[PDB]
Ligand binder design. Structure first.
Ligand SMILES: Cc1cc2nc3c(=O)[nH]c(=O)nc-3n(C[C@H](O)[C@H](O)[C@H](O)COP(=O)(O)O)c2cc1C
Ligand SMILES: Cn1nc2c(=O)n(C3CC3)ncc2c1[C@](N)(c1ccc(C(F)(F)F)c(Cl)c1)C1CC1
Ligand SMILES: O=c1cc(C(O)O)[nH]c(=O)[nH]1
Length: 369
């Protein structure tokens, strides 16, 4: 498309001279005024995918933390993504940790960030999403797109479940699915909530609040159904903990599990030495894919997987799919490849299934095993 490629020229300049968050702000500003490129081409019906009754028109979305406030949904989706996960949001607004809090190593295609759940808050983001859903009702290019909401807790909150209830009660009826973020490394003490008991109570409380929205049309979202419940897991756990978690998720009946968030155990990027925050990008790819393989077995194939971590190429995506993933989220690939990310990776993925003899994307899930 003539429009996508023009932004590629500025991409290398930005990654070299401009601060990361200015780049983020500009991208949100471009999309706010609908001057970002569009991809209105039909997607391969053999590349479509689904999680339960959620039907994704293609297997690529944008991971949480990119449009943390839902102010740029239309333009991002129209870049060629099937869905976007907004958030992570909290009940009360937060400015996050001090800036600068985002750093990029172009050579390794890696990012380290210490944002700290900066967001307008549930109320304002809820307003933004309500505005999007109204625009969705009048734009054909948005009728089949999916919007999930990642929810979290304020830094000063003590109990996580209390904050999760507020988000569900206010933005729950506008979300196609809810992602439980208990894996951020930039808010103290959160990852400790991944212990089985606490995670079990979290999932039941989140699933209880969603089911209770009906009791007290209701679903002003894409599906017209109640939102599914997903959990995003951190990769820095030992094997016994992963086993407990798998047992919890299945027992609690989780609709899916995102794998994964950022990691804190990587220490071989020279420009990131002595910096706080979680690391994203290519270096996280192989680590995350194994977390899927492990969890996919621990779950006995009964819990769908959503892949997030170092996905840059169509083959990187098929590695995630064949490992057990049903859909993929991008974040760093967007940062380092830009407006063309979705078009390039969708074209590459279609080329791949053709050579490998697959009938459709569904045939590839877990074929690695
Ligand atoms: C600057 C930055 C901010 C992020 N913010 C969030 C967030 O708010 N909530 C969340 O669940 N994940 C967040 N993430 C993690 C991403 O969603 C994703 O898991 C990570 O970037 C790895 O994917 P990638 O290798 O394709 O970049 C953030 C990542 C980065 C780099
Ligand atoms: C270079 N870039 N850096 C980013 C970054 O650091 N983030 C934050 C989350 C961590 N998000 C997006 C970042 C981009 C981005 N590739 C970009 C920004 C601005 C321009 C320009 F030239 F129009 F101004 C261009 Cl062409 C491309 C954006 C499209 C995904
Ligand atoms: O889940 C998360 C959250 C953050 C943040 O808000 O700082 N950053 C990440 O890399 N992952």
């Amino acid at each position: 498309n003539p429009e996508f490629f023009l932004y590629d020229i500025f991409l290398k300049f930005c990654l070299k001279y401009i601060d990361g968050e200015i780049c983020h702000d500009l991208f949100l500003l471009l999309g706010k005024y609908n001057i970002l490129p569009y991809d209105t081409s039909n997607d391969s019906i053999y590349a479509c995918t689904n999680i339960k009754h959620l039907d994704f028109i293609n297997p690529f979305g944008v991971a949480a933390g990119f449009d943390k406030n839902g102010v740029c949904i239309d333009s991002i989706l129209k870049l060629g993504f099937s869905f976007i996960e907004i958030g992570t949001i909290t009940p009360r607004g937060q400015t996050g940790n001090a800036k600068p809090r985002i750093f990029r190593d172009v050579e390794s295609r890696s990012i380290i960030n210490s944002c700290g759940f900066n967001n307008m808050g549930c109320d304002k983001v809820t307003e933004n999403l309500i505005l999007f859903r109204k625009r969705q009702e009048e734009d054909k290019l948005l009728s089949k797109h999916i919007v999930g909401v990642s929810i979290g807790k304020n830094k000063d909150t003590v109990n996580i479940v209390d904050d999760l209830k507020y988000c569900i009660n206010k933005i729950g009826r506008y979300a196609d699915y809810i992602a439980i973020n208990v894996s951020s490394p930039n808010t103290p003490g959160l990852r400790d909530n991944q212990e089985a008991g606490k995670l079990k109570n979290i999932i039941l409380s989140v699933k209880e609040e969603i089911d209770n929205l009906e009791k007290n049309f209701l679903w002003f979202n894409t599906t017209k159904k109640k939102p599914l419940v997903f959990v995003k897991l951190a990769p820095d756990l030992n094997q016994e903990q992963k086993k407990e978690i798998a047992d919890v998720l299945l027992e609690t009946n989780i609709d899916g599990m995102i794998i994964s968030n950022t990691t804190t155990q990587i220490n071989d990027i020279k420009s990131f030495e002595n910096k706080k925050g979680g690391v994203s990008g290519a270096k996280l790819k192989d680590i995350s894919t194994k977390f899927i393989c492990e969890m996919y077995n621990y779950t006995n194939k009964q819990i769908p997987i959503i892949a997030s971590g170092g996905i840059f190429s169509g083959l990187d995506a098929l590695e995630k799919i064949e490992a057990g993933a049903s859909v993929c989220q991008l974040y760093s690939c967007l940062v380092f490849n830009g407006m063309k990310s979705a078009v390039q990776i969708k074209r590459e993925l279609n080329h791949l299934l053709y050579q490998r003899g697959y009938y459709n994307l569904k045939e590839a899930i877990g074929r690695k095993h």
